[PDB]
Amino acid sequence: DDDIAALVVDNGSGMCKAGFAGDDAPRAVFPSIVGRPRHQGVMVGMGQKDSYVGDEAQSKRGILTLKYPIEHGIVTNWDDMEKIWHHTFYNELRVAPEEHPVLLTEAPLNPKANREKMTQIMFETFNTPAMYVAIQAVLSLYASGRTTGIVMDSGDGVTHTVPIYEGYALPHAILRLDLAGRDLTDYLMKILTERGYSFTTTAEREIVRDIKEKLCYVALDFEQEMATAASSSSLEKSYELPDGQVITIGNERFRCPEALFQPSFLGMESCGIHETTFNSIMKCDVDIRKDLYANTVLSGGTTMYPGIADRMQKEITALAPSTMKIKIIAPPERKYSVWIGGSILASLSTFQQMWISKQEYDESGPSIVHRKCF
Amino acid sequence: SLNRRIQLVEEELDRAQERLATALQKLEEAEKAADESERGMKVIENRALK
């Protein structure tokens, strides 16, 4: 059959996912952090290890400083990204990178040097036979199974909305907002000071991120929820720190996700996500807005708070004309949907013609990616 | 020497007993969830057949 399954690697600001072409689910999922020791080593006889990558960095987070190589969808330290890719290929999947083609994902709007640098790294350091760069929001529409629709994708570093009609994308209506889960985590660290809890270092940022994943939700009405929380203490939850201490957040459960809809809490002039989606729909042509309203697709791990679908539907219905229906399509496994789309892209027969070969790279330099990728 | 040997075996026995207890509790929780699943199964079946 001579068909070799192509590795699909989804790289985000928060977590790295990796698997094979045609599989249902990724084989490896792990956080994208690189940690380094910050204290004296006195037990002579133990082994020395310069850096910690992935789950092992999270396991020993006490004695390490953790740094994210990718910030706001842009990778800043390339050596950490190379270490993460090496760990992915050799310790998570146990495959030879020179055997399989690799498919990579990136944000829609970004600096142009990122594509060239990943192309050069994948063609020189890892000796892959072919590679391709795709946009995550298109892969979400592949995972949905519908040809037309508007895709909003919010991850750990970037939020972006694209419209697509019958497989044709409108590049002038693509909108990018720099609001994501890391800013929400920082805001939760800020507003937890009011109750008396102080979190400063990076391990505390991981703890606050876990608290946000456990005990945050979106209120359908913000003022009603604020009045209810002020009236009684029924809307309170308790969390347990790793050292045994118990904290009670209470009112802060629905104030952190509200910054997604009102960015004035963070000092940003830019509008909310619902406003961005409505503006992206309104920037399209007149007679495709009917199809774009009924096919709104949510994606990314940031869209996993409870009550996002109902609140976004209510806000968009308030903005849109009342004569036609608006529904929000939120699959339960949306967090991995981008990767799933990539797998479908690696399974199509015509996509074997779309790979960037090594000979083509050798002829055209790192600039071939702008010509051969959207 | 025999004192330390008995110490090691006793510690391992206590650890094994703790693991057995938590495994039994997890099994009980799994059985309860399995019962709730078939409750939901017949109520959804009734709705669909109507």
């Binding site: 689910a25 082994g47 092992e56 760990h87 409870p306 991995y336 | -």
Partner: protein
């Protein structure tokens, strides 16, 4: 809530099942490959995770594959001596310029499945056998 439960079901079933299926098959293959080379010294491993903890068997496997004389294993029964032996094996691997990432002595000693399997895979792929 309910969507979180569905996502938990999806990950816990699919990702875990596919992952540990692949580790089981690759572990059996790697165990057979190691047992093929370790019969010269007449040493045999029954479990790949457990038998590589003390570091003696890794030293003997590198002894067979390289064909050279590694330094003395440290005479001991403790955790420190196991760390010392695994660190000696990793230093000999660094001598041959075999590139390992996220590889530490305490990771091999503590019995991490993924890192032990990755170390064996790097031994099979990158390291070359002298005859």
């Amino acid at each position: 809530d309910n969507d979180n439960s569905s996502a938990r079901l999806f990950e816990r079933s699919r990702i875990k099942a596919l992952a540990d299926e692949r580790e089981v098959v690759q572990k059996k293959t790697f165990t057979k490959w190691v047992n093929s080379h370790l019969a010269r010294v007449s040493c045999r491993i029954t479990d790949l995770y457990k038998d590589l903890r003390d570091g003696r068997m890794l030293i003997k496997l590198l002894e067979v594959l390289s064909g050279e004389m590694l330094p003395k294993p440290t005479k001991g029964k403790m955790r420190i001596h196991c760390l010392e032996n695994v660190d000696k094996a990793l230093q000999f691997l660094k001598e041959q310029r075999v590139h390992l990432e996220n590889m530490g002595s305490h990771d091999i000693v503590d019995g991490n499945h993924r890192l032990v399997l990755g170390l064996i895979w790097t031994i099979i792929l990158r390291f070359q056998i002298q005859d």
